[PDB]
Amino acid sequence: MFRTAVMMAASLALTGAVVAHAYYLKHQFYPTVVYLTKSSPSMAVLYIQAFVLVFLLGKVMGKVFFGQLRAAEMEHLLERSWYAVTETCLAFTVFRDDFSPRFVALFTLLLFLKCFHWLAEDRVDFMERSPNISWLFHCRIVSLMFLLGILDFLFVSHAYHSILTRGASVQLVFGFEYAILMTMVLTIFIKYVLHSVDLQSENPWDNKAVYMLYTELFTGFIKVLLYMAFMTIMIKVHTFPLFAIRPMYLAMRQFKKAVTDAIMSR
Amino acid sequence: MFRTAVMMAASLALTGAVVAHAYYLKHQFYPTVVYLTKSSPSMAVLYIQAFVLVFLLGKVMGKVFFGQLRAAEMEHLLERSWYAVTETCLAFTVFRDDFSPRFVALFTLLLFLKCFHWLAEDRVDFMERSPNISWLFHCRIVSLMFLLGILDFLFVSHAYHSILTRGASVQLVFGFEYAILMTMVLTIFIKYVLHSVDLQSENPWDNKAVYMLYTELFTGFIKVLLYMAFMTIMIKVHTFPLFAIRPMYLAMRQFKKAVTDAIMSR
Amino acid sequence: AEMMYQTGMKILNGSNKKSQKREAYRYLQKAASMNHTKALERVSYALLFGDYLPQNIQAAREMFEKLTEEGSPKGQTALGFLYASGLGVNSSQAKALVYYTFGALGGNLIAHMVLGYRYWAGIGVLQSCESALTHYRLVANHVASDISLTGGSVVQRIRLPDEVGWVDGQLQLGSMYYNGIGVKRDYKQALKYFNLASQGGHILAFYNLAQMHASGTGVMRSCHTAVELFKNVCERGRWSERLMTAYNSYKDGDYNAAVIQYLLLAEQGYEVAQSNAAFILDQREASIVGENETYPRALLHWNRAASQGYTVARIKLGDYHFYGFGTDVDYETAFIHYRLASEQQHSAQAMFNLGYMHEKGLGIKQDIHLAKRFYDMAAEASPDAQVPVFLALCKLGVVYFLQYIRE
Amino acid sequence: AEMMYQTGMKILNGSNKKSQKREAYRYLQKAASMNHTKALERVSYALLFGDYLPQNIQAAREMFEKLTEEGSPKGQTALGFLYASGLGVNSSQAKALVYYTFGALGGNLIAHMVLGYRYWAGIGVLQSCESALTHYRLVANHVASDISLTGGSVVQRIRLPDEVGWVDGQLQLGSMYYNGIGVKRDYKQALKYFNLASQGGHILAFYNLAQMHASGTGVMRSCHTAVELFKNVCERGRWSERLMTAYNSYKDGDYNAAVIQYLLLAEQGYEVAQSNAAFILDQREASIVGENETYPRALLHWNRAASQGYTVARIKLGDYHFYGFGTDVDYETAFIHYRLASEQQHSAQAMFNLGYMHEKGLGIKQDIHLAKRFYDMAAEASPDAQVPVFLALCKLGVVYFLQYIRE
Amino acid sequence: PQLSDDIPFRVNWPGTEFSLPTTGVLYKEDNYVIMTTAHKEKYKCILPLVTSGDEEEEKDYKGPNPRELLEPLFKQSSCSYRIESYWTYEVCHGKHIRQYHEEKETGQKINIHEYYLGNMLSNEIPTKNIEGQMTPYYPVGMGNGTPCSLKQNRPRSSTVMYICHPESKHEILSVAEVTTCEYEVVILTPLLCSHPKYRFRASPVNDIFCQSLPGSPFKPLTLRQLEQQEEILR
Amino acid sequence: PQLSDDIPFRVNWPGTEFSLPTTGVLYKEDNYVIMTTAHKEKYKCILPLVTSGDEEEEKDYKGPNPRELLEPLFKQSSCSYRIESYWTYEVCHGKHIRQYHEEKETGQKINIHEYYLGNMLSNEIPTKNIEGQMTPYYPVGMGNGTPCSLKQNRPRSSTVMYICHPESKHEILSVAEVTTCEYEVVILTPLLCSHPKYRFRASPVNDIFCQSLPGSPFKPLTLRQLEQQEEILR
Numbered sequence A, B: 001m002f003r004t005a006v007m008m009a010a011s012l013a014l015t016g017a018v019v020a021h022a023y024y025l026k027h028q029f030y031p032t033v034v035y036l037t038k039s040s041p042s043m044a045v046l047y048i049q050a051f052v053l054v055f056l057l058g059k060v061m062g063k064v065f066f067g068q069l070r071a072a073e074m075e076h077l078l079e080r081s082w083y084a085v086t087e088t089c090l091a092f093t094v095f096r097d098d099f100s101p102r103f104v105a106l107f108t109l110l111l112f113l114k115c116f117h118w119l120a121e122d123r124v125d126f127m128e129r130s131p132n133i134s135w136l137f138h139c140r141i142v143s144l145m146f147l148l149g150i151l152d153f154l155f156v157s158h159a160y161h162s163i164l165t166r167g168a169s170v171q172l173v174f175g176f177e178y179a180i181l182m183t184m185v186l187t188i189f190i191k192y193v194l195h196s197v198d199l200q201s202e203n204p205w206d207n208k209a210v211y212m213l214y215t216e217l218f219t220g221f222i223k224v225l226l227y228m229a230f231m232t233i234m235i236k237v238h239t240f241p242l243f244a245i246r247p248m249y250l251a252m253r254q255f256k257k258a259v260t261d262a263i264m265s266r
Numbered sequence C, D: 001a002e003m004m005y006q007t008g009m010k011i012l013n014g015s016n017k018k019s020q021k022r023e024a025y026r027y028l029q030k031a032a033s034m035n036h037t038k039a040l041e042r043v044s045y046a047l048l049f050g051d052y053l054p055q056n057i058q059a060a061r062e063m064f065e066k067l068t069e070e071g072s073p074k075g076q077t078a079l080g081f082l083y084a085s086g087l088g089v090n091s092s093q094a095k096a097l098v099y100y101t102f103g104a105l106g107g108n109l110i111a112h113m114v115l116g117y118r119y120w121a122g123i124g125v126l127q128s129c130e131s132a133l134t135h136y137r138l139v140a141n142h143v144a145s146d147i148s149l150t151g152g153s154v155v156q157r158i159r160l161p162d163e164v165g166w167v168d169g170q171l172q173l174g175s176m177y178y179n180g181i182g183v184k185r186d187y188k189q190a191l192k193y194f195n196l197a198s199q200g201g202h203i204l205a206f207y208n209l210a211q212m213h214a215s216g217t218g219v220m221r222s223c224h225t226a227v228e229l230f231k232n233v234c235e236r237g238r239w240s241e242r243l244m245t246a247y248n249s250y251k252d253g254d255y256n257a258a259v260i261q262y263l264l265l266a267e268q269g270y271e272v273a274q275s276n277a278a279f280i281l282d283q284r285e286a287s288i289v290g291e292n293e294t295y296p297r298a299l300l301h302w303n304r305a306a307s308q309g310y311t312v313a314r315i316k317l318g319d320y321h322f323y324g325f326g327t328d329v330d331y332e333t334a335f336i337h338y339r340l341a342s343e344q345q346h347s348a349q350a351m352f353n354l355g356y357m358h359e360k361g362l363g364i365k366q367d368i369h370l371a372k373r374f375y376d377m378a379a380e381a382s383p384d385a386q387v388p389v390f391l392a393l394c395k396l397g398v399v400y401f402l403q404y405i406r407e
Numbered sequence E, F: 001p002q003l004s005d006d007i008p009f010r011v012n013w014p015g016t017e018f019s020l021p022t023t024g025v026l027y028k029e030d031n032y033v034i035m036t037t038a039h040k041e042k043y044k045c046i047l048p049l050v051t052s053g054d055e056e057e058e059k060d061y062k063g064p065n066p067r068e069l070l071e072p073l074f075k076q077s078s079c080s081y082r083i084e085s086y087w088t089y090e091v092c093h094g095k096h097i098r099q100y101h102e103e104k105e106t107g108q109k110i111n112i113h114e115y116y117l118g119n120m121l122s123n124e125i126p127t128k129n130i131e132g133q134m135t136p137y138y139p140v141g142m143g144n145g146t147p148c149s150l151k152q153n154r155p156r157s158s159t160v161m162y163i164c165h166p167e168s169k170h171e172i173l174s175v176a177e178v179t180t181c182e183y184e185v186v187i188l189t190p191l192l193c194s195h196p197k198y199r200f201r202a203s204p205v206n207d208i209f210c211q212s213l214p215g216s217p218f219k220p221l222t223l224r225q226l227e228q229q230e231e232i233l234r
């Protein structure tokens, strides 16, 4: 906790030194904020204070939604997150959208929501093998089920009206990625539905595994269809992705590990 | 082996179809080749054929330089290569160097050499704990050592004379990455020197571990120095990298795992 | 009869619709049956031209004859075009000129441009700039007059072998400098002020320097600049719109009306309309001409398009002598047309195929190290020759290495 | 004496080196001791001006007096500048005009531009366009003669508060249209052809329309266009190079010679040299002027720079009445100069500070929903107002929400 | 230096035998300058004390009250309007203020968004800062316009501002609001410029007389050739 | 149609009583056309058979051998040179061919890269080509130039190509090489155009004769005139 407060104070000391540098140069309100916007190091430190602010909001959101990290998903976020930091960074620069401090702020909103879906997956994965789960865990995770799926429904609705009214822009890849995230909250629901009927009965159910393998087959078919339609569009309009082939190979492998295993079983 | 030949034939069929489509359009040599270079799908299929060719050359080079993959480094190659192709893609696209079919080839040459250094990493890591090793393994791996070190020395020389003569371009980052790969072949030399003086004596040596830790500290210091100079250069010239902060965190962690462990030990 | 022609011109000038234009000509076609000598010349130029009346070449030849026997300038002009192009009728250059002369005599302007162009490029007659001065003038007086009234209707120049205020006042100031408005006339310095007005693109200035180089005022009267300055004025008449009537026929799939509406302007002496009227005959899309008179007629219009300074028409005159298109195969003759597009126009391809005739010993004696120069020269001339020289130079060194092994 | 002045002008016109220019003036400064009446006027304008001789204002005042008693136009002009600017001497506008009139009488051209500018903007005298026509006319004749000889030496216009052929022949054609060269004169249509020549940027055309709007030819003679057309001709004399002598003093760290070499051109009636001569006095870098006469003198040159149409000089006249710079604090007076830069010049900042006086109830009565309009209007006017309105509108709604809770 | 660009000056040449006026601006015998022209001509040009104080202009007015001057403007019903970027203000003097803007539909319809800002069913003249200057005005305040939603359905009010201009043709300098849905209109008219307390205020001119020293005539030898030169040019 | 842009034509007006010539080009009585002008003038224009065959021009030449014409060019020592993009070829007729390029150093030195391509220490005239067409030439072939590294220190050789031009001033059309370090030079001269077998070849002109029908004059009512109209600008 000491190193966390040190990191916050060592970032806020730079922001209070950048702001006090501009206010001495341009002694008013309006030419100061304009000067921060055009200057590169002045907007850089204001970016750093923004990321520390969204870091600490994530840590307090993780603390209220999960009681304690198991230190086995703590690594598992770190590789995925890196995965996610780089491909948003590559999608931001390939599209020639130019560095704007309201679409960078949108991209870390996608990454912040993407990290919370992944944390829900690993928590519901150990909900399979947790024989001692309180009612606080059950309510606090279905709250995470609702709050996410409504949020991606809202941003899909915001994006597919943006792709019609405005035209072809970067708002297409936002709503498509949230549509994949909409399938992602869809996956963890059915997995929570089948594992809630598991705990209420003091006997194993063989059809639960059959429904779980069928459900993973389902959405995996939905996932590759979303990625394949995502391929066919941006070759036609704008330019080659050069990204999003990262989770696609995992999406075919998700389809490979589900369809072929069910074919070998059934 | 059947699927590899199937993939090669299915790529060459598309390449021959594209070449025949161009030759039917522009019935000569020169307008056919110019039409292939200007067309997007034609150059795309030629890129696919080139990638399949370099894949098969990499497979035969791995077959001739390593007897058999342990099937535990094949994964390590798969994640680290994804990392790497995405870092090279993002570095290629941020720099606004434009899509040229003689710098993409250089980038895949860099990625190919990086993959071979990682394979040398894991092979000498098992050579640390291999009690039955023939002289063929020793000779082939020291041939790999030389060839790699001479190649990065040559490319570092080429890139520093380029950065002196021409001016600030992507050859600077090419030379710096090859300098990091030079530090990598340096690490494995010292590690192979110590693990070779280990095997020739039928008794363990306590000073070998101390020398290994000191060498790791050494080269970790060299690596973080190179990454910091790399930073302090490209904030100054051109633009923020937005890449190469990946292996840097692993480079400082390489420094952390060496310096702090030696401080706790000594 | 005469009442029918008024309805057609009213709907033509009043309606730009394609159906209304064809509906207007229905009375005009019916008035042609009444032998109104003004009525046929607007439907004779549709019966054989297309994109108006349906195309029927034989249906226009016999009614052109009565236009000739009447003595119509618009019938004497076009009947010479039939025998010059061999169009529906056996080709004969001998009396092709006879019909064009009487059309030029009759007051037609097309028969003066063609007769002037034939005297200028030396086609069918002796190249005489004096005779090419006389016929090219009469057109320039009759086109600069209307352009001052119509505003100079600009038309785009479309070449199929490639794809498929501030200065207005300077003309009057330069006119006063040569003539003298309140000052003594000075022909030594009024030339530079008048010649700079033509660099802006206006073609009124193109006329005024032609007369300057004609009578010898200011600069000595040279033949080469006398008619070349005249010619670009004549290439922007009300017949300059005829590219769009021909080019729309090419895009509408009527390829046989883009080879007749282009062969007239090829006869009129263009280079946009002499490559394109040969490019269509290059790919055998035309059907009026036979399958055996398709390449020699496309050789004629590739030859005229090259001598007027076109890069592709000099490479593509090398190809027709390289493979044997319309001529017995001549590697020596094809050799020259490839280097004439190399030293003169610096066409990037034209030194690559210079290498092939150097590398493989065609036409001249083989020399391996001479061929290396022109492949290397190709990469310097263009950015697109970097690739197809590199796969040519690698093949070049393989032969040099394999020959050295056998020794 | 006279032999010393020849050596200085030879090295000045022969060597452009800074040391050689100072070495040339060593004989000129020595010749000033011999009271050669041509020698002092080239070192008077260095002793008080700088970037030549070392700057010493008190060393130039007393030897300007003997230039006045001799009756020199170059001494009568500059001694008026001393009392107009209060420079080293107590300020007095009463006889600042008296010295300028005799300099204007004496044949000096600087004393005619300033007297003309004072009659034009109504500074020190009554605004009379008739008197401003007469004095601005004499400068224009004496500068239009030299540009045709010198070729029009263009000088860049640098504002410190922002950082720190084809038409030549149209002038002679438009001159012949009004006068009549072989045609009847028509003043109704020669106006449009002559006025279009000035849009190219050449100032010879700027002269000729000024006389056109003066005598009433073509268009009725209006005062506003009579001298404004005249003024831009006069702002491009051989004194237009004097920004560079002043601007180089600012970049060389000699800030007290960029406030004297700029205050003359501020007196001469510029706007590039009236903001910059006030921006330097804004930040108190000048040292000749006292610390208590630094803001009222910078208020005077911000006031003249605003009435000549500058956006920043109308915002920065709001600031000086907003905080209380050089004036007792007036929120009502500062209010007007902020809106006058909003409706007129559409300055993006000038409606943001309109919101602050609307939101916080300064000057006028407070209204929360009126302030919302101008913050919203700020974001429409510029791309850079998107940020500092958003943090202003969020603060705006916090007060509206917190007040509603207390109710 | 303090607001010094509002003080007028004028040089005169009254000659040798001249007596400075004792009424108007004050004078002193010390603040004289000895002058010299280019052709060696000596002048002694005196200057007044730059005070121009008080308002002792003998302000008398037996004419009508300022109410009576705008009555012929009211009965003639000739009233103007002003354009803006979007809106259009039509003040009608003595009837109403009308603010409206036409919405031109695609081909057939024209829609009007109209509002009503008013309708006609003290020893010191007040002054308002007009571009920072001092102009006394006539206020005509009036209300009962259309209801305003922000003031909870209260009718709008407006004050008519009258300032005089000689070349005016009944136009508007600007329309402005001191508060929400209550607007201020300024009107140019030529009627009030005859009123001494309502006319455009001009500062008194301080006169620079200057006396001709012996050896120099009544006017300088480099002066009279110039005012005749512009007289020819006119 | 086959190479038809090389056959010259000429229309003549010999009139009513004219007999077609039996020497030159062949004629027929069937290939006549009946003509009509704009003002109704009738003409009968006969045309010849387009053969222009053989070379029966009675080729006789008792003059000097082609060797003797270039001797005055050799002794006068007036010889030219040609520029290119990089190189500069200086053929000297009767001495040498010299190829060189100056390297201008930065201020003081000029470096010369020079080479030597030669030095002066049959019933059918051969024909090369020249821009596609045809021209018989005089070849003058030499060797003993500077050694060539590609041919293992063999001296270069060069042939001098002579073709005639009336307005020539001893310039070069182009310099070309048939093989490495052996070069070909073409030279324009006016001397060989007097030689019947070496002159510039022009095809014989086929004459088109127009017989005037009765009711129409010797030349059309628009001919003569219009011709002389420009005769103004002659």
Ligand SMILES: *[C@@H]1O[C@H](CO)[C@@H](O[C@@H]2O[C@H](CO)[C@@H](O[C@H]3O[C@H](CO[C@H]4O[C@H](CO[C@H]5O[C@H](CO)[C@@H](O)[C@H](O)[C@@H]5O)[C@@H](O)[C@H](O[C@H]5O[C@H](CO)[C@@H](O)[C@H](O)[C@@H]5O)[C@@H]4O)[C@@H](O[C@H]4O[C@H](CO)[C@@H](O)[C@H](O)[C@@H]4O)[C@H](O)[C@@H]3O)[C@H](O)[C@H]2NC(C)=O)[C@H](O)[C@H]1NC(C)=O
Binding pocket: D369, D372, D373, D376, D380, E085, E086, E099, E113, E115, E148, E150, E180, E181, E182
């Ligand atoms: C080039 O020219 C273009 C046009 O000439 C410029 O384009 C802009 O076009 C938009 C159109 O979308 C205009 O926006 C608004 O237009 C109408 C009208 O709304 C205006 O009027 C509102 C009236 O409210 C006040 O009315 C009285 C005024 O006397 C007051 O007494 C009263 O109390 C009340 O306050 C006004 O409110 C509004 O201004 C702002 O209002 C609020 C807060 O006041 C702000 O938050 C807003 O941002 C707004 O800007 C407008 O000035 C409007 O339609 C109205 O009427 C329809 C009727 O059916 C309703 O359905 C609808 O909901 C709305 O109520 C539009 O919806 C839109 O809001 C804009 O004014 C134009 N801009 C300019 C500068 O003219 C373009 O800018 C020009 N290009 C440039 C300058 O570069």
Ligand SMILES: *[C@@H]1O[C@H](CO)[C@@H](O[C@@H]2O[C@H](CO)[C@@H](O[C@H]3O[C@H](CO[C@H]4O[C@H](CO[C@H]5O[C@H](CO)[C@@H](O)[C@H](O)[C@@H]5O)[C@@H](O)[C@H](O[C@H]5O[C@H](CO)[C@@H](O)[C@H](O)[C@@H]5O)[C@@H]4O)[C@@H](O[C@H]4O[C@H](CO)[C@@H](O)[C@H](O)[C@@H]4O)[C@H](O)[C@@H]3O)[C@H](O)[C@H]2NC(C)=O)[C@H](O)[C@H]1NC(C)=O
Binding pocket: C369, C372, C373, C376, C380, F085, F086, F099, F113, F115, F148, F150, F180, F181, F182
């Ligand atoms: C704008 O104008 C510019 C100049 O006007 C153009 O710039 C180019 O500039 C470069 C300079 O770097 C020139 O390149 C070469 O220049 C010299 C000279 O080499 C030329 O001559 C060589 C001679 O070899 C032949 O000589 C005889 C000729 O009669 C033959 O008989 C003999 O057998 C032999 O074949 C010639 O070989 C060379 O051509 C090519 O040669 C080989 C194979 O033949 C190719 O692979 C090469 O690619 C080469 O192009 C040249 O034409 C050269 O210096 C030489 O001499 C120094 C002396 O110290 C040596 O040290 C050095 O090693 C070399 O031997 C240069 O090194 C360079 O190679 C080039 O010619 C210019 N280009 C043109 C078109 O003029 C610029 O192109 C213009 N811009 C345009 C057109 O857009």
Ligand SMILES: *[C@@H]1O[C@H](CO)[C@@H](O)[C@H](O)[C@H]1NC(C)=O
Binding pocket: C088, C089, C090
């Ligand atoms: C054209 O000439 C050929 C050969 O003389 C002949 O066979 C043919 O019938 C002629 N056609 C016409 C239409 O005259």
Ligand SMILES: *[C@@H]1O[C@H](CO)[C@@H](O)[C@H](O)[C@H]1NC(C)=O
Binding pocket: C290, C291, C292
């Ligand atoms: C040429 O014309 C004949 C008609 O006599 C036709 O049959 C033939 O197909 C044409 N083409 C060739 C190549 O002979």
Ligand SMILES: *[C@@H]1O[C@H](CO)[C@@H](O)[C@H](O)[C@H]1NC(C)=O
Binding pocket: D088, D089, D090
């Ligand atoms: C300027 O005037 C002030 C006040 O009248 C006086 O104190 C000062 O001495 C004067 N200075 C000069 C140089 O005349």
Ligand SMILES: *[C@@H]1O[C@H](CO)[C@@H](O)[C@H](O)[C@H]1NC(C)=O
Binding pocket: D290, D291, D292
């Ligand atoms: C004004 O002038 C006086 C000199 O009398 C000086 O002492 C003072 O510092 C100046 N400034 C102020 C603010 O009084």
